[PDB]
Amino acid sequence: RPTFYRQELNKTIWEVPERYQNLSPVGSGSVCAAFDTKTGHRVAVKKLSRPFQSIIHAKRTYRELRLLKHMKHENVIGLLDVFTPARSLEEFNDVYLVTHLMGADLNNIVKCQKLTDDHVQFLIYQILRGLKYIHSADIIHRDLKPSNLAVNEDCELKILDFGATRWYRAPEIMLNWMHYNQTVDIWSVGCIMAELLTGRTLFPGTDHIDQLKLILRLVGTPGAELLKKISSESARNYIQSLAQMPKMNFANVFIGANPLAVDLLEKMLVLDSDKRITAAQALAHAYFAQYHDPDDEPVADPYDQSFESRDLLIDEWKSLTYDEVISFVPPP
Ligand SMILES: CC(C)(C)c1cc(NC(=O)Nc2ccc3ccccc3c2)n(CC(=O)N2CCS(=O)(=O)CC2)n1
Numbered sequence: 001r002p003t004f005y006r007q008e009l010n011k012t013i014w015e016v017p018e019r020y021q022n023l024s025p026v027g028s029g030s031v032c033a034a035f036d037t038k039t040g041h042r043v044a045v046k047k048l049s050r051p052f053q054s055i056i057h058a059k060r061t062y063r064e065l066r067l068l069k070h071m072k073h074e075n076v077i078g079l080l081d082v083f084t085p086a087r088s089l090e091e092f093n094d095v096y097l098v099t100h101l102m103g104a105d106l107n108n109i110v111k112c113q114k115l116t117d118d119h120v121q122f123l124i125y126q127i128l129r130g131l132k133y134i135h136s137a138d139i140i141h142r143d144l145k146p147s148n149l150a151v152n153e154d155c156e157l158k159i160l161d162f163g164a165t166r167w168y169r170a171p172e173i174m175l176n177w178m179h180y181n182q183t184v185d186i187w188s189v190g191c192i193m194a195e196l197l198t199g200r201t202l203f204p205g206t207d208h209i210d211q212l213k214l215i216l217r218l219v220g221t222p223g224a225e226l227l228k229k230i231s232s233e234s235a236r237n238y239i240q241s242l243a244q245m246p247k248m249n250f251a252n253v254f255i256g257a258n259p260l261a262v263d264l265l266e267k268m269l270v271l272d273s274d275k276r277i278t279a280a281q282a283l284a285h286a287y288f289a290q291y292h293d294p295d296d297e298p299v300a301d302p303y304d305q306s307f308e309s310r311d312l313l314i315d316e317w318k319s320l321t322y323d324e325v326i327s328f329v330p331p332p
């Protein structure tokens with residue numbers, strides 16, 4: 001067991017192994033940049049806020065640790081370390097997670113640099129590659145957006161979740177549909193890719209209802225085949241309130257873009273989630289010919305999510321969380 005030290009940062013206490021130096025705030029968990037002396041690389045340290053305050057917080061904490069411990073892929077956040085100051089389960093109250101520091105998020109990149117068609121292919125490729133992995137663990141991101149995409153100076157990318165979001169959100173989540181297939185994240189990729197292509201937000205909605213009106217203007221009112229799958233008597237009427245919008249031709253909308261990019265966008269921004277391209281299918285799309293490698297798009301180990309159906313006591317979640325801190329094995 002390491003020796004820890006205490007530092008006060010923006011009224012927050014931080015007790016970290018000495019391994020980690022130069023803690024320096026990044027925003028409010030709360031997150032600090034730090035320098036890892038055992039590697040001479042810079043890292044990001046997240047202190048979980050109030051990990052065990054309620055049963056629900058406790059199950060969230062356990063959910064995060066289990067997920068981050070499972071994710072082992074180049075385009076997805078991974079765990080370099082997980083620690084606690086506690087010497088014992090009785091003392092256990094704080095969890096810290098450690099991962100690679102990345103320099104910038106995709107928003108930053110898009111704002112001060114017009115990307116070439118090659119850049120869009122590499123960036124979107126990598127998002128689909130991490131997504132193929134995450135989806136293969138039967139996980140749904142649900143909040144994919146540029147601020148959740150960490151990008152290095154070689155334009156290499158990792159998917160994570162820091163925790164308007166509405167701009168990249170599938171229309172079924174904003175109509176609280178409740179089922180949700182993994183292609184809600186594919187919706188998000190089409191929004192992001194459209195924005196990499198034009199330099200502009202595709203659906204900059206003012207609020208919830210503006211968001212939907214903007215979506216329907218591009219992709220049109222639900223066609224007969226979609227209207228047929230909507231079980232909810234209520235929803236059906238609410239939809240057939242909205243103005244009878246035609247689907248726009250995307251070739252006309254993204255005027256000077258690679259015709260392969262347009263075609264992929266048509267296959268991502270489909271109202272019907274059953275008709276949306278999957279991440280694995282998209283990786284086979286001709287727009288990615290220069291990057292696609294079917295022997296290097298790995299899938300995840302089976303992921304035991306049986307905890308999700310469990311309603312347990314705070315201290316049981318806490319004990320489970322503590323077990324997982326103990327059993328952690330850092331990467332090579
Ligand atoms: C694999 C994917 C889907 C992409 C992923 C990664 C993360 N979470 C994450 O990225 N944690 C972070 C973020 C910044 C960090 C910065 C420094 C160090 C560690 C850091 C850990 N989530 C969300 C999550 O864990 N829960 C579970 C808990 S919840 O409250 O249910 C919300 C979703 N999903």
Ligand SMILES: CCCCCCCCO[C@@H]1O[C@H](CO)[C@@H](O)[C@H](O)[C@H]1O
Pocket residue numbers: 171172175177178179180181222226229239271272273274
């Ligand atoms: C007016 C706004 C129309 C929103 C249409 C969103 C329909 C998305 O697609 C629907 O996704 C569900 C998964 O959650 C599936 O159960 C349905 O089979 C599928 O058609």
